Amino acid sequence: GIFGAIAGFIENGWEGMVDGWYGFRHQNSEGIGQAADLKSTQAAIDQINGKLNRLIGKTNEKFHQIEKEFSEVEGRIQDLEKYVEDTKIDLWSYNAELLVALENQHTIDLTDSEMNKLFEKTKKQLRENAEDMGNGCFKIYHKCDNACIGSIRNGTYDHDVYRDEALNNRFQI
Amino acid sequence: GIFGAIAGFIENGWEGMVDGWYGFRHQNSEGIGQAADLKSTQAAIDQINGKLNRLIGKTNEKFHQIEKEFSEVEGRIQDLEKYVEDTKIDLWSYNAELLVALENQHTIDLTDSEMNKLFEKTKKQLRENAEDMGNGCFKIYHKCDNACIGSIRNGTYDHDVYRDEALNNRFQI
Amino acid sequence: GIFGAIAGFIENGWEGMVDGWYGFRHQNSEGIGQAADLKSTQAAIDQINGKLNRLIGKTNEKFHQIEKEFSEVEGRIQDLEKYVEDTKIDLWSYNAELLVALENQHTIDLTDSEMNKLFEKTKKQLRENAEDMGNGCFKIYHKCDNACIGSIRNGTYDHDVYRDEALNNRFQI
Amino acid sequence: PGATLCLGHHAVPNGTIVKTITNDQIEVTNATELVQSSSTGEICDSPHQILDGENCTLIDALLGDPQCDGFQNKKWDLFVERSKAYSNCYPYDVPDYASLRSLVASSGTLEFNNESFNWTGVTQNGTSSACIRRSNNSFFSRLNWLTHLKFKYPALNVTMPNNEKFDKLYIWGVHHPGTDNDQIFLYAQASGRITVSTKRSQQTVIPNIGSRPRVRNIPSRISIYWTIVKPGDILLINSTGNLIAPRGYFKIRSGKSSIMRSDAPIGKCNSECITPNGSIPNDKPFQNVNRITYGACPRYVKQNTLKLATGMRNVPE
Amino acid sequence: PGATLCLGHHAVPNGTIVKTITNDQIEVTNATELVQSSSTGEICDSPHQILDGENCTLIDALLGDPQCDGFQNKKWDLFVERSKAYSNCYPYDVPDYASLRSLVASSGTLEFNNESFNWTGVTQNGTSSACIRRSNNSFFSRLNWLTHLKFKYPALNVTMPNNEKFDKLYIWGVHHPGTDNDQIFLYAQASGRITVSTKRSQQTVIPNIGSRPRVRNIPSRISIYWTIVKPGDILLINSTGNLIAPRGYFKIRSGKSSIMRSDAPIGKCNSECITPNGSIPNDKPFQNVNRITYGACPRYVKQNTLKLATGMRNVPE
Amino acid sequence: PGATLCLGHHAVPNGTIVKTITNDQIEVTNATELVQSSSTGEICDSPHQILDGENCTLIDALLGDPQCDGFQNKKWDLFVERSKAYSNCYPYDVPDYASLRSLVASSGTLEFNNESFNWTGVTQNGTSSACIRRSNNSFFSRLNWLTHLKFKYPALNVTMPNNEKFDKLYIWGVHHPGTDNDQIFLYAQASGRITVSTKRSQQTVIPNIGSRPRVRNIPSRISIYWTIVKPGDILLINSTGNLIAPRGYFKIRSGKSSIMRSDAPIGKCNSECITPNGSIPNDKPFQNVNRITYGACPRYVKQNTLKLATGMRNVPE
Ligand SMILES: CC(=O)N[C@@H]1[C@@H](O)[C@H](O[C@@H]2O[C@H](CO)[C@H](O)[C@H](O[C@@H]3O[C@H](CO)[C@@H](O[C@@H]4O[C@H](CO[C@]5(C(=O)O)C[C@H](O)[C@@H](NC(C)=O)[C@H]([C@H](O)[C@H](O)CO)O5)[C@H](O)[C@H](O)[C@H]4O)[C@H](O)[C@H]3NC(C)=O)[C@H]2O)[C@@H](CO)O[C@H]1O
Ligand SMILES: CC(=O)N[C@@H]1[C@@H](O)[C@H](O[C@@H]2O[C@H](CO)[C@H](O)[C@H](O[C@@H]3O[C@H](CO)[C@@H](O[C@@H]4O[C@H](CO[C@]5(C(=O)O)C[C@H](O)[C@@H](NC(C)=O)[C@H]([C@H](O)[C@H](O)CO)O5)[C@H](O)[C@H](O)[C@H]4O)[C@H](O)[C@H]3NC(C)=O)[C@H]2O)[C@@H](CO)O[C@H]1O
Ligand SMILES: CC(=O)N[C@@H]1[C@@H](O)[C@H](O[C@@H]2O[C@H](CO)[C@H](O)[C@H](O[C@@H]3O[C@H](CO)[C@@H](O[C@@H]4O[C@H](CO[C@]5(C(=O)O)C[C@H](O)[C@@H](NC(C)=O)[C@H]([C@H](O)[C@H](O)CO)O5)[C@H](O)[C@H](O)[C@H]4O)[C@H](O)[C@H]3NC(C)=O)[C@H]2O)[C@@H](CO)O[C@H]1O
Ligand SMILES: *[C@@H]1O[C@H](CO)[C@@H](O[C@@H]2O[C@H](CO)[C@@H](O[C@@H]3O[C@H](CO[C@H]4O[C@H](CO)[C@@H](O)[C@H](O)[C@@H]4O)[C@@H](O)[C@H](O[C@H]4O[C@H](CO)[C@@H](O)[C@H](O)[C@@H]4O)[C@@H]3O)[C@H](O)[C@H]2NC(C)=O)[C@H](O)[C@H]1NC(C)=O
Ligand SMILES: *[C@@H]1O[C@H](CO)[C@@H](O[C@@H]2O[C@H](CO)[C@@H](O[C@@H]3O[C@H](CO[C@H]4O[C@H](CO)[C@@H](O)[C@H](O)[C@@H]4O)[C@@H](O)[C@H](O[C@H]4O[C@H](CO)[C@@H](O)[C@H](O)[C@@H]4O)[C@@H]3O)[C@H](O)[C@H]2NC(C)=O)[C@H](O)[C@H]1NC(C)=O
Ligand SMILES: *[C@@H]1O[C@H](CO)[C@@H](O[C@@H]2O[C@H](CO)[C@@H](O[C@@H]3O[C@H](CO[C@H]4O[C@H](CO)[C@@H](O)[C@H](O)[C@@H]4O)[C@@H](O)[C@H](O[C@H]4O[C@H](CO)[C@@H](O)[C@H](O)[C@@H]4O)[C@@H]3O)[C@H](O)[C@H]2NC(C)=O)[C@H](O)[C@H]1NC(C)=O
Ligand SMILES: *[C@@H]1O[C@H](CO)[C@@H](O[C@@H]2O[C@H](CO)[C@@H](O[C@@H]3O[C@H](CO)[C@@H](O)[C@H](O)[C@@H]3O)[C@H](O)[C@H]2NC(C)=O)[C@H](O)[C@H]1NC(C)=O
Ligand SMILES: *[C@@H]1O[C@H](CO)[C@@H](O[C@@H]2O[C@H](CO)[C@@H](O[C@@H]3O[C@H](CO)[C@@H](O)[C@H](O)[C@@H]3O)[C@H](O)[C@H]2NC(C)=O)[C@H](O)[C@H]1NC(C)=O
Ligand SMILES: *[C@@H]1O[C@H](CO)[C@@H](O[C@@H]2O[C@H](CO)[C@@H](O[C@@H]3O[C@H](CO)[C@@H](O)[C@H](O)[C@@H]3O)[C@H](O)[C@H]2NC(C)=O)[C@H](O)[C@H]1NC(C)=O
Numbered sequence A, B, C: 001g002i003f004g005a006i007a008g009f010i011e012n013g014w015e016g017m018v019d020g021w022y023g024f025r026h027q028n029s030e031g032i033g034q035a036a037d038l039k040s041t042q043a044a045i046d047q048i049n050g051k052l053n054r055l056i057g058k059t060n061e062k063f064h065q066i067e068k069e070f071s072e073v074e075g076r077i078q079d080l081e082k083y084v085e086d087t088k089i090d091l092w093s094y095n096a097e098l099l100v101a102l103e104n105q106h107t108i109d110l111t112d113s114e115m116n117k118l119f120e121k122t123k124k125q126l127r128e129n130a131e132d133m134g135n136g137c138f139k140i141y142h143k144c145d146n147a148c149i150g151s152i153r154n155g156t157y158d159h160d161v162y163r164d165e166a167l168n169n170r171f172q173i
Numbered sequence D, E, F: 001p002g003a004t005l006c007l008g009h010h011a012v013p014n015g016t017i018v019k020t021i022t023n024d025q026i027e028v029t030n031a032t033e034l035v036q037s038s039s040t041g042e043i044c045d046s047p048h049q050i051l052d053g054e055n056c057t058l059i060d061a062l063l064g065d066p067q068c069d070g071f072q073n074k075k076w077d078l079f080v081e082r083s084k085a086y087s088n089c090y091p092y093d094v095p096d097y098a099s100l101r102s103l104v105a106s107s108g109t110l111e112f113n114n115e116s117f118n119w120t121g122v123t124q125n126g127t128s129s130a131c132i133r134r135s136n137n138s139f140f141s142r143l144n145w146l147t148h149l150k151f152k153y154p155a156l157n158v159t160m161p162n163n164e165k166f167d168k169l170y171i172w173g174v175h176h177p178g179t180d181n182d183q184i185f186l187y188a189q190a191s192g193r194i195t196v197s198t199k200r201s202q203q204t205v206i207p208n209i210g211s212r213p214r215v216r217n218i219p220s221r222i223s224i225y226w227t228i229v230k231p232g233d234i235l236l237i238n239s240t241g242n243l244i245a246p247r248g249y250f251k252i253r254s255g256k257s258s259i260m261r262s263d264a265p266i267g268k269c270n271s272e273c274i275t276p277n278g279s280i281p282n283d284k285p286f287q288n289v290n291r292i293t294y295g296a297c298p299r300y301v302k303q304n305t306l307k308l309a310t311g312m313r314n315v316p317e
């Protein structure tokens, strides 16, 4: 949420995108299409897997400890045994609560960050040939067929090829 | 601070804005005015209230515990009682210190984020009709009366209405 | 990493920049040069020193405690002494692990933030006289000698001086 | 001409300093305190059931010291022990005092049931000038000082079954006389031996004759012991002298009761969190009033203030 | 005409609610549970060496109650004590029972070595109807009830050197007879006195004659004691009666062994984490099954669920 | 032509690997270590007052073993006990040894004041060959072995008031003779009984005659006890034999003193943090040298290294 893309300037997500977490939809003279972006998808996945690697399958071995249940009333020593255990459990319970809250805030933020980074990268690539419509969409001011859209998604788009055409379309009356 | 708006490219805050946390000042042919932005204000407030909801009015009930003050010298058992308590208090004191430091860093960052998001939203809305002066202000290159300024603040500004006028003013010699 | 500049749109760092952490390289009619930016460098350093101030030279005094090593087998009281200590050490070990992980994530992010802020500041300063090439470089569309580059780095660049020249170069065919 | 549109944020003339990860002093527009550092100084009598011990320790109220007759059969959530409290009966000690005090505090009741022990062969109801009840020489109300009958103390072998559905707590004692002569004047034979047992447990205590420094002119002492008897078990007392006998049993309950040392006045007010300094509000997550607490309380910390930012960075004009 | 290019992100129809710093309920595309809250209900017999106590407590297996002869010399990682277990030998108690149980549990072995004690002058191998082994009157297998020989019990002053490279654990006891007559019938003189010592330590115990409530028709009791003898030290037993003698020593080891109370069945399966409710998977960092654990276990917490987001915010169409 | 202006950041050829929330290995330009993992191996003699026990345990220095006469009346912040230390006086034990050691360690002083006890009727200053001081048979310097005078040991009933403004610590003992004959040779009557009391407390100890394994050719033992006497209270000692009497009292103070077991040499240097391995620097917040510490020390953790990034991500050319 802190970057402002997911649940922000992108109005909603796409339930029909099932082969990636981030990607591109377009409309041009040949149709309307969708493609996932693998680099951004993998960047978010790698970070989340990094968190999981630090939490799953990581337990601590303990053997003989203290007694934690008691059949008879005893007073001072038993009060201390019970208090040590209750103290420990409350501290671990706090750690668990805070860990999940912090990690989840961070996951929401890092996923929003990856959406924003992809948007910014695309904006810069288009140079003077497009304008940002404010909703995560760019209006591209030149004929941009399927191979042209592909070049944008693959990072091989040469803005100079189309610049004269685009400037003419943008700065007309 | 991490987004760079508050205490960053916005030179300072406005003591005269008392009906919101974020907003707009303008100058046009009809005067100089100020208006709060309620959406951004509420977004920051809601997040801070979310933190408060997780900290205020949330105490833990404890009843019979161990003794923590002693009238006589006893040795081993009393050393252990005292050490358990001192251990507990130092761990809770650490938790409290870190909680406040982390939460405060986050509050400063999330409030800066909301200022940046409002700025970015406004920038995109203005399209080719304005330029960013670098200090959180936009120079709008067309006549923009009170109703026009209102349309920007309400999200109903139609950039196409003014684009020819604006481009003529921007790209003259 | 979360801002997308360092290890992101900036392809790599500069081993030959030894008098600052962030800065500028240029090419113009008089040569290719490098200069550090002191404000951004100091901003990152101050934040990291703030963390260090809260961790280094801050120890807690403890005096008489409990015994932690034992020459003879005793049963219940010794089991409790050992468990209290093992409990304490595991909680402090967890605190240390999490502290370093969180602080390091934050340091990487705050340093990336400072690089991004400097880039954004420079972009805004250049107004309509330059375009972002996508790799942290700007193409400046006017003659910009050493004093002109200096004015950009010192925040005294007057975009109006060069605007007619720049617009002519940008929006030609 | 055109227009200018500026984005901005508020500021205040009276900001507050908070700590962050990177700065120990940064000014924000508003903050809230997370450490409770004050009390009114009164222990509120609601909503916990408070029992002010006044002149009595819990253990004196248990045994039945004459200043504590008003406490019979009372219950509490929190028993409040005052520093001025003193004993004014026969001088005694309790091996493991701390444990008896703790287990009675936690049980939360002085409910006592009399039982008819078969003390055939001895004199009952022995009293002393060290324990005045209404100008008359007296003794602990829950204990029965047995002495010779016609210069005979025949061996006691007395039983009491627990046919209840709950546990019974028996409080009893051994009299240590100050002299060999006192042993004879009271019990008609040389130093006894007490054995109190059940199917599950056994305790034997040896009286030790000798002078202790005088307390209310008494060089003798009583040592107090206790025994818990489970349902379907049986108390057996076996003695040839020096037995300070039980008159019955205490109910032993489990729950949320405790005990606290404090000189704070009890007030007619409502507060969930009790400390020895008085009740404290419990809105805040932390407190630095006292490590000793009872009820729904903030957690004790060493810091006297921790400010949580509730606004943005303050950047005045 | 030109083109439109839109950037976006996925969403799912079935999102999951997680907690964050600023919101207690936010929907994400996917999450994973961090608290293990279930068991199958069986204690897996692998990879830890499990010893099911069946009818026997550890202490009954130690002393050698007749139901526990199958346990001789066995080792364990985890000894499992069942709630149905009961004693069926001579009635005894252990001052400090909890500590003896703990130290044997931790040692992880019942390895016992017989030694030839010089009991010249007394009758050995005393037995009782309260301890039946194969319809015959019997006694604890690891203990030796000494009585008079021809109405003489001469003073015992018996030594046993530790010339091993390890520590020796000796278990011994004192017989408390029910009557003065029983004292005479067994030991031929008035109440004894036992002193067990080494160069480093000493313990003296006094038999206390008297009636306790009958258990398997026995009003007498045995009290159990223990002594650890270091290499090059020497056990010395000094008694004039009432000695329940050791027959040898237990090895005392150090390692990872323990004891647990549970009624869970032992299963033929493999699990690293044991609780009294059964084994649990240990993939998750936390668990709310039981605070009592053995092995590589998740840490016990109070929460029954903690969901970790593994996807972005879910923003459905 | 125009110009190009590029924004960038530094990098280094020799980066360092750190851990983060999302990556266990990321290279940064610089880092600093947060775990202290080394010591020089010396305990610095400043700024804490160090007392090297040399051949003496604290308890031997207290009682007055002949190797420890140099320790009289000394104070410490930290008493250092060496593994080579051994006792070389009359063989003794201390029930609760750990507690006496702890309370004296914490008090931080061996300040002793002699008092004139009225021991009329007995022989004082008994000595032994098991406790040599300057080739002569001797005894613990702070204890007074009382024996018969002209084959009489009349009952002792000796008092000592505390008219000071501080508490007094009395150390005393009971002699357990090896044989019935030794009892007679020393005390002229059958086995005694000791009762040490105040207005607040009482302790009675029974000598137990019998052979223990010989230590420096002594089959007898002394058992050590202690009593704290508050201002305006009175010590009363009541015995008919076997008393190892106090010669006076120790002052008992409160403060920051303690005791540590270590074989590290004491060095002429200055360090605030002491461990058994030696002093350690205390700049870092954590340490993995030893869980045992004294002074201003980093907190013990299990990790041997924790690197804190002090620079940006390193992205080499
Ligand atoms: C016909 C005939 O010949 N009969 C014989 C009897 O003479 C004889 O009885 C005994 O006679 C002697 C005198 O030779 C003496 O009077 C015996 O009574 C004791 O008296 C002493 C000295 O006065 C007294 O000691 C003093 O005690 C007080 C305080 O006293 C109380 C108390 O605590 O308030 C009084 C209580 O009633 C008593 N409690 C009970 C249950 O009896 C207690 C208790 O004795 C003590 O607390 C235990 O330490 O004492 C004060 O402490 C003074 O400082 C102290 O000097 C004793 O208290 C008296 N003892 C009793 C039991 O009353 C008297 O028995 C008989 C027995 O040999 O033999 C007949 O044949
Ligand atoms: C020639 C001559 O004149 N010889 C003399 C002998 O008469 C005399 O021997 C004694 O004689 C008396 C009768 O006057 C009596 O028979 C003595 O034996 C005891 O008998 C009582 C009464 O029956 C008995 O008490 C009962 O005990 C049972 C259970 O008994 C066992 C058990 O636990 O199973 C039997 C065990 O073998 C025994 N253990 C050992 C090691 O001996 C134990 C043990 O005695 C108890 O557990 C200790 O409490 O008891 C049940 O408890 C009943 O309720 C109870 O009434 C005693 O158990 C018998 N004691 C013994 C040692 O056998 C008999 O000794 C001799 C001695 O004065 O003198 C000669 O000169
Ligand atoms: C005129 C007349 O007829 N007078 C009678 C006296 O004869 C008689 O005196 C007693 O006589 C017998 C002999 O029949 C014997 O000598 C008594 O003295 C004991 O002797 C034994 C045997 O030698 C001895 O035991 C040995 O002790 C040593 C070590 O000894 C010391 C020590 O620890 O160094 C010496 C110390 O001075 C002593 N301490 C004190 C305060 O006296 C201690 C202490 O006795 C022990 O530590 C306690 O265990 O011992 C070593 O341990 C050997 O292995 C061991 O055999 C005793 O130590 C001697 N006891 C004493 C008190 O000196 C002698 O008393 C008199 C009494 O019946 O009656 C007259 O009528
Ligand atoms: C600086 O930042 C803080 C924190 O955000 C603000 O403090 C909050 O201010 C609001 C508005 O005044 C408070 O709201 C009121 O709460 C009362 C409960 O007070 C007690 O209980 C809580 C917890 O149980 C304690 O934390 C607190 O200290 C008190 O002991 C209610 O009784 C009030 O109700 C009244 O007003 C509402 C209006 O809708 C009506 O519904 C009712 O009829 C009634 O009349 C009210 O809801 C809130 O408690 C404060 N929070 C904290 C943590 O202190 C500051 O306002 C802010 N300062 C500035 C200048 O902005
Ligand atoms: C929502 O988010 C979660 C977490 O990211 C995803 O859950 C993971 O899903 C993957 C793919 O199904 C799982 O990968 C598999 O792990 C198995 C191990 O399972 C046990 O062990 C772990 C820890 O020890 C436990 O956490 C787990 O619950 C099990 O008890 C492997 O055996 C699997 O191997 C098989 O497939 C691979 C394919 O490469 C082959 O190499 C093998 O031959 C074999 O056939 C597999 O690797 C992973 O365990 C899950 N993690 C967790 C924490 O649950 C969800 O998939 C995701 N949901 C959606 C809709 O995206
Ligand atoms: C990688 O990152 C680390 C951490 O930021 C840098 O380490 C710091 O480096 C500076 C400069 O060298 C150090 O500053 C010096 O500190 C000395 C104190 O040293 C001891 O005390 C501290 C804590 O009490 C310990 O952490 C430390 O290890 C030592 O035991 C001062 O004595 C020095 O003073 C001298 O120089 C100053 C210059 O202004 C003068 O005022 C004095 O006259 C005097 O001559 C100096 O201040 C700092 O201690 C280091 N911090 C840590 C935590 O190690 C690395 O420099 C950096 N590496 C690179 C390549 O950038
Ligand atoms: C053993 O010694 C102690 C201590 O000296 C003796 O106790 C003391 O005994 C005297 C004489 O009985 C007590 O005197 C009494 O004092 C009270 C109170 O002021 C007074 O009212 C009486 O008139 C009487 O004089 C003294 O208090 C007491 N001291 C202490 C400290 O208890 C004890 O009697 C001796 N025991 C034996 C058996 O000899
Ligand atoms: C002291 O009092 C106790 C309790 O009254 C006495 O114990 C009781 O003694 C009787 C008589 O021996 C026991 O009776 C026996 O019961 C068994 C079991 O049912 C039965 O098989 C026998 O036939 C016999 O009647 C009774 O069980 C026992 N009660 C308890 C609670 O142990 C004790 O004997 C007295 N001691 C002395 C020395 O007087
Ligand atoms: C009870 O049995 C113990 C153990 O057998 C007896 O202790 C032993 O007594 C003998 C004879 O006095 C001691 O011999 C002495 O050894 C020393 C040191 O080498 C030597 O210098 C003497 O010449 C003498 O021969 C032996 O050390 C001692 N053993 C132990 C382990 O203490 C004890 O005397 C018996 N007690 C009674 C009252 O019978």
Ligand SMILES: *[C@@H]1O[C@H](CO)[C@@H](O)[C@H](O)[C@H]1NC(C)=O
Residues within 6 Å of the ligand: D014, D015, D016, D029, D030, D031
């Ligand atoms: C600033 O002043 C107002 C009005 O007097 C007050 O309500 C508010 O709490 C103050 N804020 C701070 C941060 O002190």
Ligand SMILES: *[C@@H]1O[C@H](CO)[C@@H](O)[C@H](O)[C@H]1NC(C)=O
Residues within 6 Å of the ligand: D155, D156, D157, D193, D194, D195, D238, D239, D240, E209, E210, E211
């Ligand atoms: C227990 O009571 C019996 C029977 O009255 C008696 O023989 C015995 O002496 C008593 N025991 C004690 C220790 O008082």
Ligand SMILES: *[C@@H]1O[C@H](CO)[C@@H](O)[C@H](O)[C@H]1NC(C)=O
Residues within 6 Å of the ligand: E155, E156, E157, E193, E194, E195, E238, E239, E240, F209, F210, F211
């Ligand atoms: C110890 O044994 C000796 C020698 O046989 C004997 O004199 C003494 O009475 C025994 N002591 C005890 C307490 O049984």
Ligand SMILES: *[C@@H]1O[C@H](CO)[C@@H](O)[C@H](O)[C@H]1NC(C)=O
Residues within 6 Å of the ligand: D209, D210, D211, F155, F156, F157, F193, F194, F195, F238, F239, F240
């Ligand atoms: C205590 O001293 C008195 C008076 O001298 C005496 O009668 C008594 O026997 C002594 N008590 C003991 C246990 O030594």
